[PDB]
Write a protein that binds this ligand. Structure first.
Ligand SMILES: NC(=O)N1c2ccccc2C=Cc2ccccc21
Length: 128
């Protein structure tokens, strides 16, 4: 609802400055979100996907903008790239791709009414 400076260490400097609560992971605060997203640090560090960190942050500390007041998700493609790189390694060690991160419930780019986010390199790109 109101924008707050991102305070999750993993997500600081990710390409956007502000987040909001609640997220879609049943977190009311960044402290709660930070405790869950920190558990992914080994996968971030092993670099199974250059997109994993941006994807994680875009979900757990979603972007907050002053001039767009609708939830703004990562585009489905960001999720698909992160999943393609990292889900096989995750399965090998007994971890499923989390249901809340199912890429098919994220919107595709080009939507007439709403936006979604990708990035280049780190600069956010809105593609809608
Ligand atoms: N909070 C939301 O409604 N969205 C949306 C919005 C439109 C479509 C799917 C989704 C799914 C989850 C999600 C994740 C991050 C940021 C926003 C967000």
């Amino acid at each position: 609802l109101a924008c707050q400076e991102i305070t999750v260490p993993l997500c600081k400097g990710i390409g956007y400055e502000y987040t909001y609560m609640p997220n879609q992971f049943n977190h009311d605060t960044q402290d709660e979100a930070g405790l869950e997203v920190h558990q992914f640090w080994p996968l971030v560090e092993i670099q199974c996907s250059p997109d994993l960190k941006f994807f994680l942050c875009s979900m757990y500390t979603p972007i907050c903008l002053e001039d767009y007041k609708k939830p703004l998700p990562p585009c489905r493609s960001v999720c698909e790239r992160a999943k393609a790189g990292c889900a096989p390694l995750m399965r090998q060690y007994g971890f499923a791709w989390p249901d809340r991160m199912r890429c098919d419930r994220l919107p595709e780019q080009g939507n007439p009414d709403t936006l979604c986010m990708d990035y280049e390199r780190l600069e956010v790109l809105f593609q809608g």
